[PDB]
Amino acid sequence: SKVTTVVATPGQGPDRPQEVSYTDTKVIGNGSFGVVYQAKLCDSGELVAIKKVLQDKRFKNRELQIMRKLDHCNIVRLRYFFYSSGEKKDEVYLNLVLDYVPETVYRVARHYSRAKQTLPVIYVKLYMYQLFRSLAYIHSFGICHRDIKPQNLLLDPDTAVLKLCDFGSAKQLVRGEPNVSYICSRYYRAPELIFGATDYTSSIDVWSAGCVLAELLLGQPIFPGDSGVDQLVEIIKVLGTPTREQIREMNPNYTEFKFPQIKAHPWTKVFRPRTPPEAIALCSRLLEYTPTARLTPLEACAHSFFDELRDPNVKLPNGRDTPALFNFTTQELSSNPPLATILIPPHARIQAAA
Amino acid sequence: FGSMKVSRDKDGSKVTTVVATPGQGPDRPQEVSYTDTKVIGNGSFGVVYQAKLCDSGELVAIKKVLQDKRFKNRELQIMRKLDHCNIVRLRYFFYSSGEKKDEVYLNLVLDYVPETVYRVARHYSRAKQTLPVIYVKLYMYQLFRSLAYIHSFGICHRDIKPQNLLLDPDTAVLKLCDFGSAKQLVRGEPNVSYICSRYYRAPELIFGATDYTSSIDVWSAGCVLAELLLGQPIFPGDSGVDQLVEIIKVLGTPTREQIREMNPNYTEFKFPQIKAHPWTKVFRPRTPPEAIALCSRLLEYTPTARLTPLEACAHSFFDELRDPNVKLPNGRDTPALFNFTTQELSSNPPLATILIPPHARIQA
Numbered sequence A: 001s002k003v004t005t006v007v008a009t010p011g012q013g014p015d016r017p018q019e020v021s022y023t024d025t026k027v028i029g030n031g032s033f034g035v036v037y038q039a040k041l042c043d044s045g046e047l048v049a050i051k052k053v054l055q056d057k058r059f060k061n062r063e064l065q066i067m068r069k070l071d072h073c074n075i076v077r078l079r080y081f082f083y084s085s086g087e088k089k090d091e092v093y094l095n096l097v098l099d100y101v102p103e104t105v106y107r108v109a110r111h112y113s114r115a116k117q118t119l120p121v122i123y124v125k126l127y128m129y130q131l132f133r134s135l136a137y138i139h140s141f142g143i144c145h146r147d148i149k150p151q152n153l154l155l156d157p158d159t160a161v162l163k164l165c166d167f168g169s170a171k172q173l174v175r176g177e178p179n180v181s182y183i184c185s186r187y188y189r190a191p192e193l194i195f196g197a198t199d200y201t202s203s204i205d206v207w208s209a210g211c212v213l214a215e216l217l218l219g220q221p222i223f224p225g226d227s228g229v230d231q232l233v234e235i236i237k238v239l240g241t242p243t244r245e246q247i248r249e250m251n252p253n254y255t256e257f258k259f260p261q262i263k264a265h266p267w268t269k270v271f272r273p274r275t276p277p278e279a280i281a282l283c284s285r286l287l288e289y290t291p292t293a294r295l296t297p298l299e300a301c302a303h304s305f306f307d308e309l310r311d312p313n314v315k316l317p318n319g320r321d322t323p324a325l326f327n328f329t330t331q332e333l334s335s336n337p338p339l340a341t342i343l344i345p346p347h348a349r350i351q352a353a354a
Numbered sequence B: 001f002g003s004m005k006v007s008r009d010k011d012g013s014k015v016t017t018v019v020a021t022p023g024q025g026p027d028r029p030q031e032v033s034y035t036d037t038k039v040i041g042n043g044s045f046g047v048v049y050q051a052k053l054c055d056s057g058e059l060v061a062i063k064k065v066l067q068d069k070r071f072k073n074r075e076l077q078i079m080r081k082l083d084h085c086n087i088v089r090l091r092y093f094f095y096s097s098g099e100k101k102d103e104v105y106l107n108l109v110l111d112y113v114p115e116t117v118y119r120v121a122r123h124y125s126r127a128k129q130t131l132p133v134i135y136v137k138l139y140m141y142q143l144f145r146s147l148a149y150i151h152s153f154g155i156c157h158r159d160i161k162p163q164n165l166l167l168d169p170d171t172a173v174l175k176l177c178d179f180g181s182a183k184q185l186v187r188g189e190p191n192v193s194y195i196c197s198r199y200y201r202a203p204e205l206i207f208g209a210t211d212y213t214s215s216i217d218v219w220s221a222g223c224v225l226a227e228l229l230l231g232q233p234i235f236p237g238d239s240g241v242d243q244l245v246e247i248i249k250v251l252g253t254p255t256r257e258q259i260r261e262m263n264p265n266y267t268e269f270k271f272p273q274i275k276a277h278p279w280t281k282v283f284r285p286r287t288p289p290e291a292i293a294l295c296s297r298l299l300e301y302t303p304t305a306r307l308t309p310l311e312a313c314a315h316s317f318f319d320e321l322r323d324p325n326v327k328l329p330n331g332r333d334t335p336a337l338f339n340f341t342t343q344e345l346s347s348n349p350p351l352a353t354i355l356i357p358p359h360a361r362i363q364a
């Protein structure tokens, strides 16, 4: 029962540090940048995850700066942050104290994959809708996650709540400012990224999201490949060869234009026969070559595929009610306010003033 | 646009007869008949089959790829001019009509090789063992020879990885294969940076350079060497940033100048300032120091700073291969290692004074 007490700064609000004690510290993962532990807050008994990262003393942490301003039900909450020293030297570590979430879309999907079972579409709708809400939210601040993948989507299976995590690659994208094309994990990288564009936009997160949806529907990654060339061949097999304008839309630079002219593969033949047409339709509107042609996250949320979620009688397979799905804020709807008419159904958020 | 002729020699045995063009010799079509066709590979481009030559009984591999009636096949054009003991041989090629449509398939008939560095390394990895260093020396040396050869023609493979390195276990012969990404690099001409497999990509490729040279193959070979010594890939990562982190952990943070060397264009300069990781601390204890020295000279940020394939061949890590009494563990003789040609040595002729050991120069 070794207790650790630190003076940590609330993730949000005023920089007014408080003493915080925790115990039952057990490693629960690793990262190229640092370790992630689980601990229990002594005062509340609540479980949290502590992401420890080496911090450059001379510069401020971008991940921390971004986390501090986010407050959405579908994004993992930064509870506190504090600094600790790495005895290995005069090394200083930034410790992010986050809400603890038990699962990830990756592990859950792997379970169904192994059991040779399909993840019920009700969950595909629930998880994807919540991911789009988190993207609509961060994108409204000009922030692009840049690493959307199953492992960065935390899940609480009992409540069916999804929380986007890992803002280690996130960045506010400013029109005209170049950005590195080597972010984002293989399989989920937008074509413009594979083509080396540095003028990409937040729509790269929408392509990534589309790859997650298709993978949840298919039971395996939709555009695998060990090399950029292999990945592009898989994309072309499904979408057909990119037009000259489309290539120009992604990145008007890359030389090699030598690519087998394949006709677009009917999106319907891509998935199993039982697959809902709305799911396929949504897919084709996310996985588009021309970045600007892709649906925005908010538009995705309003898509027909998510209509069941807006049904007043919908319930979770475990009998519980669905989690929060309609508590949209002005900020979240800013990219297209009129969508509120679709996004907040008649029965939702009905509350009188006594 | 050609055709085949299927029949049944005897016992119901299906025999396919085609008219193929010699891979290297003059265009004298020859009739080729084979049986027992079974898939032994598959790529986004086509399928690789194993077939038995009807008369010689010889086994061969047939790489079937969809052919674009638009331009000529670059892989075939390159393979046709190659002739080296450490490069898989193109016996002949022929076209076959894909019964699927007006689609034509190019068929490359290659010498068949039983293993790949990928499979062998995985066998040892599973058993939590490591490949004896003598094999690491033999395989890497042969890989560098094949690279010195194609590079002498200005050709860059662009996809060096364990799966593209065929091996004959008994003879310990290694043959480079898969020239589907290969291209002659002409200074001043831009080239795509999305070639090469993750884990084996040079940093300038990760940074998106389009003015890279053949030295990217040298970086890739360095990753193979390090991997054969470690038992696992040295620079894994699901994203480019993760890969760069692993690289920086070992090589240290790249100086602003080194960055300029790989790609003078990419933005992000925001990367943890880690100190150079003692290469000796990277490998298991008792790893030959020469092996570690070679790795460090192959895996350099600055492209022009990496050893060339011929220089790698002359490295001291391979001194044992030049010993007159060196033999394979199975008591057998090592494969041909010193029959260098003028072409092969063209990059630095004087290196031959090291590459060709005294005993190999004995008249007899």
Ligand SMILES: Nc1ncnc2c1ncn2[C@@H]1O[C@H](COP(=O)(O)OP(=O)(O)O)[C@@H](O)[C@H]1O
Residues within 6 Å of the ligand: A028, A029, A030, A031, A032, A033, A034, A036, A048, A049, A051, A076, A098, A099, A100, A101, A102, A104, A151, A152, A154, A165, A166, A167, A168
């Ligand atoms: N709040 C959390 N609750 C539970 N597990 C977490 C939490 N945050 C992270 N993890 C686990 O740790 C892994 C690494 O965390 P992450 O934030 O993605 O760091 P990295 O930069 O290495 O990707 C995650 O993919 C996840 O499995």
Ligand SMILES: Nc1ncnc2c1ncn2[C@@H]1O[C@H](COP(=O)(O)OP(=O)(O)O)[C@@H](O)[C@H]1O
Residues within 6 Å of the ligand: B040, B041, B042, B043, B044, B045, B046, B048, B060, B061, B063, B088, B110, B111, B112, B113, B114, B116, B163, B164, B166, B177, B178, B179, B180
């Ligand atoms: N000559 C050969 N002998 C035996 N197996 C081969 C031969 N050429 C290729 N293969 C097998 O087929 C796989 C794919 O061949 P490759 O030429 O690399 O095609 P691609 O990478 O374009 O799919 C190889 O990694 C190897 O295992």
Ligand SMILES: [Mg+2]
Residues within 6 Å of the ligand: A151, A152, A166
């Ligand atoms: Mg992660």
Ligand SMILES: [Mg+2]
Residues within 6 Å of the ligand: B163, B164, B178
């Ligand atoms: Mg290959």
